[PDB]
Amino acid sequence: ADQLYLENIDEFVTDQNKIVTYKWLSYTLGVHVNQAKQMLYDYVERKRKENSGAQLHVTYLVSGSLIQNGHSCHKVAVVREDKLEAVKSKLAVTASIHVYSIQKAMLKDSGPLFNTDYDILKSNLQNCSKFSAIQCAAAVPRA
Amino acid sequence: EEAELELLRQFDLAWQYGPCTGITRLQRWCRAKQMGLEPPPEVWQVLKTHPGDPRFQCSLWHLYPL
Amino acid sequence: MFSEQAAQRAHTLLSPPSANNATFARVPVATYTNSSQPFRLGERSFSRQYAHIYATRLIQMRPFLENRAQQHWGSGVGVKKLCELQPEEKCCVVGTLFKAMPLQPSILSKYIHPDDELVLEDELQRIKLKGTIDVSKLVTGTVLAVFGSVRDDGKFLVEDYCFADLAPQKPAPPLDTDRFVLLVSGLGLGGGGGESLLGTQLLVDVVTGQLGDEGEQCSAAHVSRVILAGNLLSHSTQSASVEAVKMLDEILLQLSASVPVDVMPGEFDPTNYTLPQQPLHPCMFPLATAYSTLQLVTNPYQATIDGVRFLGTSGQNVSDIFRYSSMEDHLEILEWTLRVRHISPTAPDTLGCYPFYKTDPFIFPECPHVYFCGNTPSFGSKIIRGPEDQTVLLVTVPDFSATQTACLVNLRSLACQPISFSGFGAEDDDL
Amino acid sequence: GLLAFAKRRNCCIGCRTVLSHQGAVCEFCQPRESELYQKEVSHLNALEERFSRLWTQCQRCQGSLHEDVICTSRDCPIFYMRKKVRKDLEDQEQLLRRFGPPGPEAW
Numbered sequence: 039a040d041q042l043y044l045e046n047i048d049e050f051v052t053d054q055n056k057i058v059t060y061k062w063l064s065y066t067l068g069v070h071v072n073q074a075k076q077m078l079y080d081y082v083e084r085k086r087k088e089n090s091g092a093q094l095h096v097t098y099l100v101s102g103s104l105i106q107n108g109h110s111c112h113k114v115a116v117v118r119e120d121k122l123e124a125v126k127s128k129l130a131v132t133a134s135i136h137v138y139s140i141q142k143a144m145l146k147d148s149g150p151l152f153n154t155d156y157d158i159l160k161s162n163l164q165n166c167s168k169f170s171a172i173q174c175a176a177a178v179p180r181a
Numbered sequence: 182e183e184a185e186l187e188l189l190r191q192f193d194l195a196w197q198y199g200p201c202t203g204i205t206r207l208q209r210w211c212r213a214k215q216m217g218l219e220p221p222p223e224v225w226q227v228l229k230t231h232p233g234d235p236r237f238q239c240s241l242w243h244l245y246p247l
Numbered sequence: 248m249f250s251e252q253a254a255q256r257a258h259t260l261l262s263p264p265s266a267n268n269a270t271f272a273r274v275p276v277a278t279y280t281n282s283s284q285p286f287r288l289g290e291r292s293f294s295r296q297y298a299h300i301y302a303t304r305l306i307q308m309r310p311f312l313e314n315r316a317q318q319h320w321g322s323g324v325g326v327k328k329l330c331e332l333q334p335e336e337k338c339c340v341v342g343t344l345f346k347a348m349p350l351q352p353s354i355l356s357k358y359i360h361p362d363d364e365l366v367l368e369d370e371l372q373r374i375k376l377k378g379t380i381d382v383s384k385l386v387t388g389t390v391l392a393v394f395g396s397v398r399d400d401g402k403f404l405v406e407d408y409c410f411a412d413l414a415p416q417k418p419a420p421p422l423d424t425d426r427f428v429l430l431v432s433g434l435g436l437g438g439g440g441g442e443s444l445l446g447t448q449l450l451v452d453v454v455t456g457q458l459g460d461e462g463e464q465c466s467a468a469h470v471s472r473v474i475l476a477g478n479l480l481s482h483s484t485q486s487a488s489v490e491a492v493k494m495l496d497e498i499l500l501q502l503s504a505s506v507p508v509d510v511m512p513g514e515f516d517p518t519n520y521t522l523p524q525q526p527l528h529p530c531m532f533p534l535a536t537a538y539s540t541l542q543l544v545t546n547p548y549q550a551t552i553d554g555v556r557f558l559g560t561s562g563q564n565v566s567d568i569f570r571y572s573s574m575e576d577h578l579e580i581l582e583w584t585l586r587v588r589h590i591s592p593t594a595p596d597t598l599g600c601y602p603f604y605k606t607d608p609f610i611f612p613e614c615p616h617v618y619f620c621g622n623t624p625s626f627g628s629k630i631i632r633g634p635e636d637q638t639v640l641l642v643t644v645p646d647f648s649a650t651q652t653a654c655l656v657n658l659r660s661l662a663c664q665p666i667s668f669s670g671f672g673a674e675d676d677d678l
Numbered sequence: 679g680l681l682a683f684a685k686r687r688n689c690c691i692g693c694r695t696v697l698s699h700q701g702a703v704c705e706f707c708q709p710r711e712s713e714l715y716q717k718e719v720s721h722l723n724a725l726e727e728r729f730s731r732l733w734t735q736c737q738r739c740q741g742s743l744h745e746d747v748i749c750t751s752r753d754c755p756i757f758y759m760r761k762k763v764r765k766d767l768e769d770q771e772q773l774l775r776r777f778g779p780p781g782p783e784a785w
């Protein structure tokens with residue numbers, strides 16, 4: 039159960055030296071999207087409670103309301119591991135926190151995090167609403 | 182005939198029915214009737230007792246490379 | 248509105264795995280009606296001349312201006328044709344402007360110049376105009392009524408003048424549960440960055456139901472429609488375009504899976520040039536035409552989405568008025584366009600259109616509840632009132648390639664909120 | 679004389695092979711059709727832009743915006759350059775109706 043995905047993540051991350059988003063880890067193991075975020079949080083909590091000095095880097099996502107000049111906007115950001123709490127304190131209302139990615143050796147910008155999702159989409163084209171939380175009804179291939 | 186060819190030439194230059202040198206004659210007659218400016222019921226009654234003749238059912242300068 | 252409701256629950260996602268995770272359903276779109284039939288052109292014969300359009304514009308717009316000058320200057324009326332004027336006598340004239348500007352290019356950045364004349368023109372003759380009138384706020388093609396007298400040098404002295412105004416507006420039924428509508432414009436696929444790529448990915452991931460907690464997934468499930476408005480492929484130089492339609496087909500596939508989508512042609516898009524732009528041909532989209540949730544429309548788009556009626560363009564009239572006038576605020580230019588009862592008054596003189604001959608279709612025959620624009624450089628929204636009971640919400644849609652901002656319109660409270668997307672860049676706060 | 683007794687043989691837009699039926703593409707060059715539609719609509723687009731710049735220039739050289747143009751001035755380049763774009767557009771509009779319509783029109 040737990041050792042299954044724990045060993046799968048430990049060979050995907052530290053051995054093949056890859057970059058694991060939640061959508062890649064849900065197209066590999068055939069899992070729901072929210073359960074995949076929970077899986078990644080489980081792995082990072084276990085290996086950060088075990089050792090505290092791993093070769094492990096995280097990136098999160100923060101979403102929520104804001105007011106700049108009167109108006110109420112809705113700001114959504116993919117954030118690094120240092121700057122989380124300041125971004126959390128700038129916001130007014132908080133609406134979504136989960137985990138986005140983990141790494142071995144630190145990147146410089148948000149470059150390859152689009153390459154990964156794009157390439158795993160490229161071969162998997164007959165399903166994108168397969169693991170989606172919203173299942174509409176009138177959209178079935180007809181024409 | 183020869184009196185019906187001046188009534189149409191008089192309908193074609195009256196400015197209160199429109200600026201018409203690109204279209205047919207009966208299309209301009211029905212365009213004015215829709216807006217109902219005042220089309221007269223005689224420039225209709227010669228475009229019905231004829232077939233598709235190009236010297237009744239055409240604007241004055243439907244030659245003329247303008 | 249939206250982000251208020253998105254926090255209305257409990258948060259589950261910083262937790263170890265569970266037995267179940269919640270799912271939802273897309274809200275039904277149980278009423279829709281396209282009523283943009285005067286812009287869909289089936290016959291398309293050229294070989295006319297542009298004089299049939301001005302004549303029917305004047306003939307249709309004349310009784311509105313007579314009926315407004317009566318109740319705006321008193322029923323002791325002095326409305327008169329331009330030839331029957333006597334020297335130095337008080338009268339009202341209804342005509343068409345023509346602005347005589349040099350620096351406008353002929354066949355062989357603003358273009359307003361410190362000297363340029365206005366000329367009031369009717370079907371038979373013209374007259375010059377001076378007095379108390381704005382020289383640089385007005386553009387060629389507006390039809391208006393005016394008050395004054397013929398002076399001695401043949402010119403005309405103007406005291407005050409009035410425009411046509413808003414058309415009637417029937418009221419809409421109120422709604423039970425709030426449904427939202429998302430508006431995007433100008434993705435710019437073909438060039439324009441890599442932060443735009445992650446921005447487009449995060450936008451489609453939010454609306455399809457892949458991102459965020461049960462708050463975001465409950466709130467994005469209520470978004471009923473998606474409208475993409477023009478300028479889908481921003482082009483760097485024509486003489487590239489073949490590889491971009493593949494990626495646009497993939498994106499429209501990933502959106503046609505969950506939501507209904509409406510796609511409109513823009514300034515650069517593979518269609519014609521004249522103003523009632525016809526829909527895109529389906530032979531450039533192999534993948535996305537599998538589903539019956541994708542729809543392709545034209546330039547001026549009308550619709551009746553859940554009782555609320557929409558009308559919009561991809562921002563070709565507003566920038567054309569911006570070229571040959573002095574107004575800067577795009578929301579103001581949109582409202583001014585509403586005030587003279589014409590979607591695009593500068594056509595045809597500096598913005599090309601088809602040569603119609605039966606009826607000019609850019610005159611408003613009714614008043615829309617929402618009226619949006621296209622590729623404007625910044626967000627803006629406003630509410631305006633009519634003389635009668637007429638209220639209109641005005642939105643300017645931003646451009647996604649620079650700002651990365653879209654708009655949510657509520658269909659029960661009738662308000663508009665911006666949404667912005669920003670991944671982290673090459674940012675290091677220790678330098 | 680002989681020019682009236684035409685047959686008007688259709689031709690493939692890709693490789694110029696005369697054939698029976700009205701479809702635009704050839705059976706060997708059928709796949710590459712989205713690129714062949716992409717090509718030539720950027721030509722119709724540039725003919726549309728040339729029609730409008732010319733036929734409204736006569737309205738400003740004439741004086742009036744509400745009445746017909748009558749000027750067959752043989753020393754003006756404007757005359758007979760405004761005559762050929764009508765036929766270019768007439769021809770290029772009919773070549774794209776080889777392809778079907780992009781939607782219905784009677785709804």
Ligand code: SF4
Pocket residue numbers: 735736739740747749750751754755756757
């Ligand atoms: S054809 Fe040439 S000379 Fe004649 S009105 Fe047109 S622009 Fe002027």
Ligand SMILES: [Zn+2]
Pocket residue numbers: 690691692693694695703704705706707
């Ligand atoms: Zn061929």
